[PDB]
Design a protein around this ligand. Sequence first.
Ligand SMILES: CCC(=O)N[C@H]1[C@H]([C@H](O)[C@H](O)CO)O[C@@](OCCCn2cc(CN(Cc3cn(CCCO[C@]4(C(=O)O)C[C@H](O)[C@@H](NC(=O)CC)[C@H]([C@H](O)[C@H](O)CO)O4)nn3)Cc3cn(CCCO[C@]4(C(=O)O)C[C@H](O)[C@@H](NC(=O)CC)[C@H]([C@H](O)[C@H](O)CO)O4)nn3)nn2)(C(=O)O)C[C@@H]1O
Ligand SMILES: [Cl-]
Ligand SMILES: [Cl-]
Ligand SMILES: [Cl-]
Ligand code: NA
Ligand SMILES: [Zn+2]
Ligand SMILES: [Zn+2]
Ligand SMILES: [Zn+2]
Lengths: 183, 184, 185
Amino acid sequence: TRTLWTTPDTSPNCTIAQDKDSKLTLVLTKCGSQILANVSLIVVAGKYHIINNKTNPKIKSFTIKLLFNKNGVLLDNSNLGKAYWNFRSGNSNVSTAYEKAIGFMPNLVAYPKPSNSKKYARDIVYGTIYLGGKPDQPAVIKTTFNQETGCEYSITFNFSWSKTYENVEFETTSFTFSYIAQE
Amino acid sequence: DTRTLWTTPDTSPNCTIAQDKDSKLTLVLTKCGSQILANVSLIVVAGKYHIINNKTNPKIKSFTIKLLFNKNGVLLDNSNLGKAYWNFRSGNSNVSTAYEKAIGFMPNLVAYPKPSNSKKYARDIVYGTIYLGGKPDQPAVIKTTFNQETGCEYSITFNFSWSKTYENVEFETTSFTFSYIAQE
Amino acid sequence: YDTRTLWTTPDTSPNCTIAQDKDSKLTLVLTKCGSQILANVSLIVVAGKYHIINNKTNPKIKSFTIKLLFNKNGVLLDNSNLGKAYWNFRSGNSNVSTAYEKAIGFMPNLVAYPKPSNSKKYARDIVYGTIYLGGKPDQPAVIKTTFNQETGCEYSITFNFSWSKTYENVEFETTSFTFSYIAQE
Ligand SMILES: CCC(=O)N[C@H]1[C@H]([C@H](O)[C@H](O)CO)O[C@@](OCCCn2cc(CN(Cc3cn(CCCO[C@]4(C(=O)O)C[C@H](O)[C@@H](NC(=O)CC)[C@H]([C@H](O)[C@H](O)CO)O4)nn3)Cc3cn(CCCO[C@]4(C(=O)O)C[C@H](O)[C@@H](NC(=O)CC)[C@H]([C@H](O)[C@H](O)CO)O4)nn3)nn2)(C(=O)O)C[C@@H]1O
Ligand SMILES: [Cl-]
Ligand SMILES: [Cl-]
Ligand SMILES: [Cl-]
Ligand code: NA
Ligand SMILES: [Zn+2]
Ligand SMILES: [Zn+2]
Ligand SMILES: [Zn+2]
């Protein structure tokens, strides 16, 4: 029944374009064979803080990657900082870094690493979130399992938009999804 | 605690949007540790929002259903949802005693703070779309907001809206699932 | 043995018959979180009529249905599109070795989602979602899931897939979708 999370405060914990430019709020709750996931994003500074596609027509997407080793431990090339990711204790985290979280990893049979074998779309979940909570400011959140190199498991969030936003702050509504657990 | 707080799954009106008991809100909240798994649908049976005609009434485009809770997670009487059949599940009905404590089912206050002079972040909203009459060409938006009402310690608010011009369409919906971060 | 999960296994071995025998893999995982079932679904078509969609050549091919029919004990009936052989409780990445006898706690609730009758039919028993063919964001298809509307069974879950765009040689294999439903017990 346990939960891996980023504390749900607004303290930046994530680096998209520059150090600590964002707060990823991610909560993974183990419900047996499935992980129930809840995600939102606040960009606080830098390139993706205020979108202006009149000024910058090609600024239309970015990616946040969580890379994990064989024990389900977060690797430092991840966009999310290691100090910010742990099992929940109250509204905070355990003060000791976890050793094992394989039960939270995306299942490798469901979602295999890239190979020469046919690639299926099963390892992707699509959703839409809304910038500033406004229903006319959609952005697509594409979540992909186990497609990154340099790791045993991965979860990546690609944010993209097709509208021409003029001075829109990139901070989002929340989205829930699930995925099949490794064990 | 993997308990379920719900409205019961019957179709007996339990909700007051425009007039007394004009609707059945079916809401099921199931605790999976630090997240609440929520399932929701709505049937309007009477009054202003029962049969929508936007040719004759083009400005009838949205309405709101509020659930207000005290410090103990107990539903307040001024909610649109009636208190009588909002309780922990037993079979297809409820436990025989009104609950006194459900803080573990409340939306987390750090994730979703009450209104203040601090910046309001969008992460206290979840958007979804449901379909009137089960028809794929009859979308309506369900906007769910956590802890943005006053006169309570916690809240869940459902705003229903639509942009299509409906003509004599009965407002009864498909179901939507979401989750939120639990207070404890 | 995992008593809280009924699934198809996560492999890609065909287990489903839409238009011809074993033309598809339905990956379906039902996880009991008490009074709610958390469901995760995707579909891979490997052969036959629904494998490669070409609506220039075949303008009428726009939808199909996959039916799961259950008896009073929550056991899958053999007229379901999904095969009984690999629908079972989880054991690792496989299944428990004997066929299950009871799964009533995984069935969609009959008061929430009643069988057809003279009583008014409500839309509550439907969940709509959209999945994406080939993982491409410009290739939507609608997944309409309906609870307990089939005859000849105690319970049912049916998945209707449809699309409105004119696809030209698009393989029908989907992204994943999550939903939940109210459990019978
Ligand atoms: C699950 C069942 C279902 O989907 N039902 C839908 C049915 C059904 O498909 C058919 O009836 C068949 O049964 O169709 C409906 O629509 C068809 C008839 C009406 N219609 C609408 C359109 C869209 N346009 C016309 C148009 C619409 N607008 C509305 C304003 C603009 O849109 C927003 C906005 O403000 O930006 C979008 C935003 O998300 C809305 N917010 C919410 O919904 C909040 C939850 C917002 C809001 O509603 C208003 O602001 C409130 O006032 O509106 N303007 N103009 C025709 C059109 C053609 N295109 C181009 C591409 C078509 O779309 C796809 C694609 O196929 O490529 C669709 C695909 O899903 C997208 N992928 C993703 O989103 C990934 C997650 C892609 C992708 O975005 C791009 O490819 C980029 O990669 O685009 N666009 N518009 N046309 N016709 C119906 O019958 O009513 C809707 C039912 O919901
Ligand atoms: Cl655990
Ligand atoms: Cl009441
Ligand atoms: Cl045809
Ligand atoms: Na606007
Ligand atoms: Zn700013
Ligand atoms: Zn009516
Ligand atoms: Zn193929």
